């Protein structure tokens, strides 16, 4: 009576092969979100956004992105605004939202902008040679650092989808 499942015919194709075009489609939406952050908080810059987009394309194409966060961080803790994108498999109808809906008017005085990436299991299992070939075009290289915390809560407010894969966006929200 009250137990339901998603309609069988509503499921999208489940046999999609993720390509560079799908990578660029997701990365363009992140770039948009970053440009929206810039308009209301001053960072990141257009040139940094361009490099973030290139980086995202390379990691998505290779399947090496687990999760990446961009935004303002105090001490070792993210504050609002901070946008986090977790890679996953496309579900159901495959929600592919428009980018945007950055909250304006938040206090960021003490923090500086940062980004932090977590690589996927496929990356950790890859050979050194596989990594070198897949990541040749990286615009910059990242250095290990202690995982940051969150000063606030996470709101899951967008999903970007392409080629059988999804990016799930959570936005850090201040306690109020």
């Amino acid at each position: 009576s009250h137990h339901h499942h998603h309609h069988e015919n509503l499921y999208f194709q489940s046999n999609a092969t993720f390509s560079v075009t799908h990578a660029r489609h997701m990365a363009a939406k992140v770039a948009t979100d970053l440009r929206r952050m810039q308009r209301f908080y001053g960072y990141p810059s257009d040139a940094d956004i361009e490099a973030y987009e290139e980086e995202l394309v390379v990691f998505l194409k290779a399947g090496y992105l687990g999760e990446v966060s961009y935004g303002f961080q105090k001490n070792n803790n993210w504050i609002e605004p901070t946008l986090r994108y977790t890679a996953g498999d496309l579900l159901g109808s495959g929600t592919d939202d428009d980018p945007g809906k950055i909250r304006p008017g938040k206090d960021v005085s003490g923090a500086s902008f940062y980004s932090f990436m977590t690589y996927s299991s496929k990356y950790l299992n890859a050979t050194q040679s596989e990594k070198d070939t897949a990541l040749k075009d990286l615009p910059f290289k990242r250095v290990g650092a202690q995982s940051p915390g969150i000063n606030g809560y996470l709101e899951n407010d967008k999903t970007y989808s392409a080629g059988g894969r999804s990016l799930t966006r959570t936005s850090v929200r201040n306690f109020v």
Binding site: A28, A31, T32, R35, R39, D98, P99, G100, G105
Partner: protein, 315 residues
């Protein structure tokens, strides 16, 4: 991305679909000039006649008219003790006086309305929308329009002229793009209201503040970012005709002050619900324009710009 839609794309779109074609604007101006010439001729023969001047007063006179213009705005200055001080009576008075000065037209062509008197011609062009202004000899053609509201069409037209002189073409074009967007929001969104004059004054304030109007996507983004981040709570005053001291205290939520009348707040009527609508709409449009900047294909770029400018936009 910009490869698919850029400033020149928007500029072409504005001419094709947004702006009032010059040919049509010329026709409308000649229509008004015809009435004005008749009034001057009649006034010359009868100096005691109440109707002292007819001035084109709206978007057409300011060069901010959209393709969708449906009438020609003019003000008629009315003097003397005979003219009533009630709008129904004053509009009746205006209509009778218009009938006297236009003996070639039939009486039925001149029809009064709630806030104005309309002169219509059957099957030959747009109607002329005439707003009465009570005149008592104040300088700069200052007059009053249920209390009396002081105004000067020449000074209002002068204000816009100075901004158009500061940024030729670009200022009037951005004003028209923003009005065109505001019209699309009103049909798409129920509680949405955005007076054309407020749009004009907000953009004039941005121009005064140094915003660059020569790139239409970025100029629109400055407009949209201003609305979102100030939340329409920043008072807008110009010092063209008076110092900012003159405003005094106001209890109004939105304060966008008539550059001709320091006592008139154009946004006086706007509520918090009206503001939330503008803000939400401006956020959506800013989200779409920045999405179009990075969109990987032409099709997505057009679809994002259609959030701002509607189905007429095709890139």
């Amino acid at each position: 991305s910009t490869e698919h839609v850029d400033h020149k794309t928007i500029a072409r779109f504005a001419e094709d679909k947004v702006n009032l074609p010059k040919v049509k604007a010329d026709d409308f101006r000649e229509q008004a000039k015809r009435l004005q010439n008749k009034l001057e001729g009649y006034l010359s023969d009868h100096p005691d006649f109440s109707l002292k001047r007819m001035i084109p007063s709206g978007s057409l006179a300011k060069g901010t008219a959209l393709r969708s213009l449906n009438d020609i705005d003019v003000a008629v200055y009315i003097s003397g003790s005979d003219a009533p001080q009630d709008l129904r009576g004053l509009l009746d008075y205006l209509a009778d006086r218009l009938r006297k000065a236009f003996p070639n037209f039939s009486p039925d062509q001149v029809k009064p309305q709630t806030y104005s008197v309309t002169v219509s011609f059957r099957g030959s062009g747009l109607d002329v929308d005439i707003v009465p202004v009570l005149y008592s000899g104040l300088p700069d053609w200052r007059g009053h329009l249920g209390s009396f509201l002081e105004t000067s069409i020449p000074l209002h037209l002068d204000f816009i002229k100075a901004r158009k002189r500061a940024a030729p073409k670009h200022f009037a074009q951005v004003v028209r793009l923003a009005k065109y967007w505001a019209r699309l929001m009103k049909q798409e969104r129920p509680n949405f209201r955005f007076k054309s004059f407020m749009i004009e004054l907000i953009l004039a304030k941005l121009l005064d503040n140094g915003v660059d109007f020569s790139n239409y996507p970025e100029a629109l983004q400055a407009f949209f970012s201003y609305l979102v981040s100030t939340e329409l709570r920043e008072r807008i005053v110009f010092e063209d005709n008076y110092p900012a001291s003159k405003i005094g205290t106001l209890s109004d939520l939105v304060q966008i002050i008539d550059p001709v009348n320091p006592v008139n707040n154009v946004a006086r009527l706007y509520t918090q619900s009206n503001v939330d609508a503008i803000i939400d709409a401006a956020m959506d449009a800013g989200d779409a324009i920045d999405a179009a900047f990075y969109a990987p294909t032409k099709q997505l770029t057009v679809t994002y710009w259609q959030k701002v400018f509607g189905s007429s936009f095709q890139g």
